[PDB]
UniProtKB/Swiss-Prot annotation, chain B:
Name of the gene encoding the protein in the UniProt record: rpl35a
Protein's job: Component of the ribosome, a large ribonucleoprotein complex responsible for the synthesis of proteins in the cell. The small ribosomal subunit (SSU) binds messenger RNAs (mRNAs) and translates the encoded message by selecting cognate aminoacyl-transfer RNA (tRNA) molecules. The large subunit (LSU) contains the ribosomal catalytic site termed the peptidyl transferase center (PTC), which catalyzes the formation of peptide bonds, thereby polymerizing the amino acids delivered by tRNAs into a polypeptide chain.
Protein name as annotated: Large ribosomal subunit protein eL33B
Keyword Ribosomal protein among record annotations: yes
Subcellular location: Cytoplasm
Chief localisation class: cytoplasm
Pfam families linked to this entry: Ribosomal_L35Ae
Gene3D superfamilies: translation elongation factor selb, chain A, domain 4
Disulfide-bond pairs as recorded: none
Self-association state and partner proteins as the record states: Component of the large ribosomal subunit (LSU). Mature yeast ribosomes consist of a small (40S) and a large (60S) subunit. The 40S small subunit contains 1 molecule of ribosomal RNA (18S rRNA) and at least 33 different proteins. The large 60S subunit contains 3 rRNA molecules (25S, 5.8S and 5S rRNA) and at least 46 different proteins.
Signal peptide: none
Family: Belongs to the eukaryotic ribosomal protein eL33 family.
Swiss-Prot record, chain D:
Organism (species): Schizosaccharomyces pombe (strain 972 / ATCC 24843) (Fission yeast)
Cited NCBIfam families: L13_A_E
Protein name: Large ribosomal subunit protein uL13B
Record keyword Acetylation present: no
Matches recorded under Gene3D superfamilies: 6.10.250.3250, Ribosomal protein L13
Swiss-Prot record, chain E:
GO molecular function: structural constituent of ribosome
Subcellular locations according to the entry: Cytoplasm
Chief location of this protein within or outside the cell: cytoplasm
Record keywords, A-Z: Cytoplasm, Ribonucleoprotein, Ribosomal protein
Annotated organism of origin: Schizosaccharomyces pombe (strain 972 / ATCC 24843)
One GO BP: cytoplasmic translation
Name of the protein: Large ribosomal subunit protein eL20A
Alphabetical list of HAMAP family matching this protein: Ribosomal_eL20 (MF_00273)
From Swiss-Prot, chain F:
Cell location: Cytoplasm; Nucleus
Protein name: Large ribosomal subunit protein eL14
Xref: PANTHER family: 60S RIBOSOMAL PROTEIN L14, LARGE RIBOSOMAL SUBUNIT PROTEIN EL14
Family to which this protein belongs: Belongs to the eukaryotic ribosomal protein eL14 family.
Name of the gene: rpl14
Pfam family, one: KOW
Organismal lineage: Eukaryota, Fungi, Dikarya, Ascomycota, Taphrinomycotina
Function field: Component of the ribosome, a large ribonucleoprotein complex responsible for the synthesis of proteins in the cell. The small ribosomal subunit (SSU) binds messenger RNAs (mRNAs) and translates the encoded message by selecting cognate aminoacyl-transfer RNA (tRNA) molecules. The large subunit (LSU) contains the ribosomal catalytic site termed the peptidyl transferase center (PTC), which catalyzes the formation of peptide bonds, thereby polymerizing the amino acids delivered by tRNAs into a polypeptide chain.
GO CC term, one of those recorded: cytosol
Amino acid sequence: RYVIATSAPKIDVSGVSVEKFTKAYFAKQKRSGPVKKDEAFFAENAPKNALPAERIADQKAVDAKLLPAIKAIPNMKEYLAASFALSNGDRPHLMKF
Amino acid sequence: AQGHRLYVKAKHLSFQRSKHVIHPGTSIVKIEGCDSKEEAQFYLGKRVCYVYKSSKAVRGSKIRVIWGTIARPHGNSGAVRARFVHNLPAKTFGSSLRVMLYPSNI
Amino acid sequence: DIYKDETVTVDIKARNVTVQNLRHVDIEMKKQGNTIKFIVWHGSRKHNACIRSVYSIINNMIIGVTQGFRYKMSLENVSQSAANIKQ
Amino acid sequence: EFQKVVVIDAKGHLLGRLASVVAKQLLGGQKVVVVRCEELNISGHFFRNKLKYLAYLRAFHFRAPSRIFQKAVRGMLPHKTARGQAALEHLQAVEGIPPPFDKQKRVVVPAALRVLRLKPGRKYCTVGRLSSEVGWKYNDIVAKLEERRKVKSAAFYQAKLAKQKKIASAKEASPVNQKLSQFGY
Amino acid sequence: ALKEYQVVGRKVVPKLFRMRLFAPNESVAKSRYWYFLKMINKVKKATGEIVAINEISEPKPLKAKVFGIWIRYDSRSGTHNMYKEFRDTTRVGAVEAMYADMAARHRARFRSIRILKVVEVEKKEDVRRNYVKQLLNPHLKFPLPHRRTKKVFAPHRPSTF
Amino acid sequence: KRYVEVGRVVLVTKGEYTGKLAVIVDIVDHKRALIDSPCSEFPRQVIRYGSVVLTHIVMKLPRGARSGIVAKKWKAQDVCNKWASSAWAKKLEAKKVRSQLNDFDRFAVMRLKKQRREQVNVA
RNA sequence: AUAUGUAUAAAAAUAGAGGUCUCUCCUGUAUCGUAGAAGAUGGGCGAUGGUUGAUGAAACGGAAGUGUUUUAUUGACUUGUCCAUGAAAUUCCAGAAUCCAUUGCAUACGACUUUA
RNA sequence: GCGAAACCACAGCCUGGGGGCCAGG
RNA sequence: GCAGAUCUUGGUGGAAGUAGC
RNA sequence: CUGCCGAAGAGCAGAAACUCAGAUCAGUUUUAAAUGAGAGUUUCUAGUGGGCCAUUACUGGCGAUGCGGGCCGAACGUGAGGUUAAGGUGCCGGAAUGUACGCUAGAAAGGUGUUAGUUAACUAGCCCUGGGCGCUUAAGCGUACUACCCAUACCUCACCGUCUGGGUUAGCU
RNA sequence: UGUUUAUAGCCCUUGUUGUAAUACGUCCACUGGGGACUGAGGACUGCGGCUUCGUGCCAAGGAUGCUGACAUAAUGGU
């Protein structure tokens, strides 16, 4: 409900495995943080939630499997690097996405 | 030119009312470019909001937003009826609202 | 009337029939050849009354321009001036 | 399409139609400026509005065409309420075209134009001439100032058109305009 | 919209009376027929019955014709007879013009008007109206008048030419 | 230069035939006219002048011509590509095409007009 | 004396105007600007470009001219074109006046004219 | 310097229509 | 079981620092 | 304090007692049965026996009755949503500066003012004479077709209350 | 000016392409979406439907499931 589906030509995505992306893959870290009653006071133990390496590796692997598909067809690289924004005279009820 | 805008400008016209009785619970909103009840069917269910200033730094900001939703068309000339979580103040007649594009179906 | 059209140059720019003016009454001029086809397309009886006056006024101005003579004993202007002189 | 400030050339517009259009805009939070209010037109012969005004003369009696239009808008607004008085302060009706406004685009209201609303041959009065007969005495200078502004604006248009000629010629010169002209631009 | 309706009826071997009248729908047509029959041959509405109610279309709907309509007016005095001619492409089309015209000029209502007869005059000589004759001239050519044509506050003044 | 007469070709601007191109065949009265078009999807109908604009093009046509012969007359005098010759049709078709682009095609036009503005060479 | 790009300037007519005997109008659904970690960091090709911030100016704008240009620099960006790095776990939307004094051209009293 | 009293629903701009109501000034 | 009875009793107002001595 | 019933303007309102779809009725209509409703009685015991408006002495309405419109509409528990009546959609004001057809101040007779017709004379319509702003191929007048606005009204649901009817004991883990 | 499809064509009747087409009316226990309001009830009992019978399943005697934000706040009152 928060995406505009455009009529731009589709990108070849069949070449990247997607079955690993499940509900558990995107879930948030369950509340925990095993702590003892001397460091919770004087609260300097909080680690950071920096994205682990395999998330970066999966992102890079997806980029490798996606870049040739977007490079071959013209204007894809500049289109995706762009941003969508309305201006005066643009009427969304009449513009065909 | 600058862009970064994902909303359609709208005006808070008035409340729903008869000649002498007013209903603050429903508001009349005129959207830019929507001039018929056929085009007003597009904006139904969208989220309309009223954004204003204040003085207290609520979470470190002077901005305040009253959200809402477009409910149905009103009349023939593209006016719509908008329901807001808090009824809009009467002093905001002719003010400028923001009709976001979500939830989207096109 | 449905069509009550009637008859130097006849240039009808901005309803001015400069050979003169016709802005006062909506009747067309159309400068049809040497004549000025002074048309009325479904107008009003006032337009029919004006055209009979306009046709004579245009003809009198054209006659006066070509040869106004004296007629002691500018057409309307001369007659009004003569009446003013007499008064 | 609405914005914050609009300038309306009142020439060829009817008094009631334009005021009603203006009043609805003002109550919607839109600041409206009406220029050349002495070129406003009124349906009916000159004497009809003339007897209307002298009956009004028989309350403050104001003769200026700009304030004639201002009264017309005022009756179309809830002036007794704080909301109406707020709307009225957003309206700047002036005669002629002040220099701050002659350098900006001026829109016209098709729903109020005399050509689109009056049958040809219908007698019509002009507010400027009507005002000049009921006490207003500034139409000579207003008309004279209009000619000077019109002459200066005409020279600006010629300069703008001359500059437009260069870019217009250079438009089709570039082959890109014809390379992908199929997009409709 | 108005519609032509052929109504045939008779009192419960009584003679069958058929006539053409213009009504918005069938129910108005049958009541109108009964009222017309009541004032012609004095047949009671309750006693009589309708044997056939059929709708009539225009055989030549895309051909311009001239229709002569004879009707009975009810006025302040309530007694008047006129005849008027209309040029259009349908019998029902002229009737709407007839009703619109008389409600305009003479301030009439649909109930006070009864159609006496409507005929199609195909002879130009038979036309008795100057406007109809002028419209039938072989050189009919006139500029379109009364043109005059949301987006309020247009940017440039209308051309209107 | 725009006289409502038999044979003049008109453009419909109201109803479901907006943008369709038709020609007057007969003058019903002072408020209506009968039109026709060679295009099959345009039927023979009687419409009012409030829905049309009088195109300056004029075609020779006998009064009361049938639908089929009107198409032959239109083909004979080559009204097609003659209406398109005028700048009026070019602007209308360009606007009609400009109403169809998706976001990609609009972004292509973004780049195209960027490739055209950069020169601004003047003497 | 002290506010979400806040963009768009001829006149007059709808029973005609503008531009070079010819052409156009029939609305702006148009035109200018519009990709960038809210706009990052580099390299090449083609023209002397475009956008500007700060100085230095000169010409114009008097109806309410508070704005228009021409520029001479300086400091930046430049997507005109094509490539190279970075964005992430915000892991689905939120120095005067007066009093006091003084003048009588003024005066019921104030006020005014004076000086003072 | 001394010092009341009666009285007080509430208050105080006009015109017209039905001193506050309606529409205007 | 109070809002009123030009209710009863007490207290306190505007009039008013007015009229006035 | 809340609830329920509720007039009048002998009759009208309840309470007990009985007798009850296997009973009679009706501000109704057909004919010379249809349809709705369960029908009644003895007894007592409070209140009133004004007037006003309108159509034709009658009939209603006002009065004990607020709400939408400005007489028309509509009989009222607390709300949500939908839809409407009357009246409306230029602005004030919620809603089409809608579409289409027409006429030109407006919401006894006169006129060389006008538009359609009848046989120079008459007929019909508008103009002169006898809520505001504003409006003029209307935002005036008439007809037709759509769309729109909103009542305490209509429909759906929730909730409060009252009334009517039904269930509920070897009190079953 | 007068004529009868020629170097335009038009009107009327019949046949034919004919089980035309379309508009209108009406119907489907045909179907695809968008928007808004509501979630009363509280073990099973019922009426139905699929499923071979199934403590089977189901949109069938009234809402559940999946998530996110906050305690220095979110939210609601005076």
